[PDB]
Symmetry: D2
Subunit: 202 residues, 4 copies
């Protein structure tokens, strides 16, 4: 009876990932999940953040979004991670959050949860696919059940066709309707699969 527990954990410096993660959170709500939308703790020093108005502005924009904790992943049945690409991997901020999950991992409390990932870069082929890859490889250490979107909808094709997960080319400009649709399909599908797995076991 109880709704799928979905945790969307994103890092964003300049707002693309925050926009993407809200789209993911709404998709999950629309599809019947109980959602936690959670920001990855910022590690940068203020004097660095201060050099970028858009970074400082997004931090302000997300101020009422709670910070991700391990408890949130223990709670979750379905997990989505979203990070911007940093040299073809996830941000250090995201990896620092992951590096706090060792206790939960040691307890077996990350196993069997569904996992998918999203990303953004300033270049269309700028290491996005590898950023997604590295997040999935991590989830495998947890015994997670990975639910990438594939090409299971016409929307994937329409938005540049990334079967590994939603990836958005960041150019300051708001999200395109095709990217939004790619995110929606990814999340709805994951929620649907998670509901099925949970029903089969209970």
């Amino acid at each position: 009876t109880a709704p799928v527990k979905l945790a969307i954990v994103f890092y964003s410096s300049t707002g693309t990932g925050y926009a993407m993660a809200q789209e993911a959170a709404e998709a999950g709500r629309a599809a019947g999940a109980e959602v936690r939308l959670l920001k990855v703790r910022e590690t940068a020093p203020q004097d660095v953040i201060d050099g970028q108005d858009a970074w400082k502005a997004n931090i302000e924009a997300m101020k009422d979004v709670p910070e991700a904790t391990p408890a949130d992943l223990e709670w979750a049945e379905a997990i989505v991670f979203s990070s911007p690409t940093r040299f073809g991997g996830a941000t250090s901020q995201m990896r620092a959050f992951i590096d706090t999950l060792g206790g939960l991992w040691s307890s077996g409390k990350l196993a069997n949860k569904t996992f998918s990932a999203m990303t953004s870069a300033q270049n269309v082929n700028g290491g996005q696919e590898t950023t997604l890859q590295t997040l999935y490889m991590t989830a495998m250490h947890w015994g997670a059940v990975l639910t990438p979107p594939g090409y299971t909808d016409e929307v994937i094709f329409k938005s540049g066709g990334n079967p590994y997960g939603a990836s958005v080319t960041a150019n300051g400009q708001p999200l395109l309707e095709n990217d939004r649709a790619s995110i929606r399909h990814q999340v709805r599908r994951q929620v649907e699969l998670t509901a099925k797995l949970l029903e089969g076991g209970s």
Copy 2:
């Protein structure tokens, strides 16, 4: 009520993969699945084969193992791929079989199937991880549901702790007990997840 349909598709030149895939097949039957154990079509030139008598012999050893076909994956609810490494990737033989799945893929007919992988190498760090990775990335294009073992049983730790999939150091000696138990756990786990998936979807 109907058993999980498990297809175990493997390439083997000299017998390592054949032994691994037999162990997988036993594990699946023991876990209540209906199992197809299936060999990848040998695509190598007979002059190349004729310089390795163990390869010729293993071909004959597997004479009553049917050749894998797209039909088998269309049938399958749970899929296991097994290939030895060639320079950190799968064998060309395995990729040739993958490359015949285009029609099923176009028809949305590989989606929502479970998937894990296994591999071997003559070196312990010589592509026992990268080979599995490349097979998982391929399954993501299908919209498969990836069910790697992670560290979800003690036997994974005992056999070298490969969370991505069973991996065996190929030396001509019989399969170690710890490797066998890691294969069995992986396949059992995947059968059980598949069954829950199917149960909750009707």
Copy 3:
């Protein structure tokens, strides 16, 4: 005062890789290298080739292009591999070629050659990056010196920004200038690096 020996080894079904490889070959010549443009042997059955006009046409268009053999890599001081993506890996045809390199590898005669790679897919984010990655990982087994382009020109940006290697979105219509400039720089740069390494060796 030997020109650098550059082998461009490419697989192409429908002509995109052939256009890319020709651009690579011209850039190599312009950089003062001695160039071989070499096609990967086609393994597809004729009745599969017979299903697609652009595939049949491309095979005929490439008729006078020599077929790649291991001795081409023994000859080369600088190697480029190009393959279209198949589910985020290289084609079986390219892997089949790679699998013929075991004797050369055993002899130690692949070591120390420079290596970079190129790819294509129908979708912008449809597995190109992973295809390149799998190709670089293979080259590492050889002790190749990997020379990917990174962002060392501002025409990487203009091409879509692929630091791992040129990657084109296959549309049937011809190659864009940005893609062509990306390829040219990648090859010119690799030839320059290779010439320095050889001069340094004597």
Copy 4:
């Protein structure tokens, strides 16, 4: 001048430190001017405080200078070493990587040689994928990647990782076969770097 070699390594409990010292000594033996550099510790002290070996190693490394972006600008050859965290590099290593954005955008990381090393508690527990993530990173800089491959018998004897040295961390001292693989990797990288620089002079 001698090849400028920077060994940048993260270590919590000393395995990476031992690997990096072996690497630094190999670089010197090969005639390079060597910087042995630690990645800044970012873990909260209360986490470090839970583990004696982690506290002890931080003290053991106290006189190793912290890596900065300018060390990579200086360097002609770079080696990165991180233990695995779920098949990727440590957040500490990534945090250092993330400070290289300025050098990257000015193109001041191009044409340097790069290889990587790693460790895990499990032999197949990310000893290949961690290396691969670090190599992908270096591609973004236009680095020239010089992994060991199977270019010496010692590679086979240490488990046959062609991507880079990888050690199974059991808390015991470094095995000799592992030391030898690290030495070969670094010696080979220095040699290639020297040829590249000589040829471009």
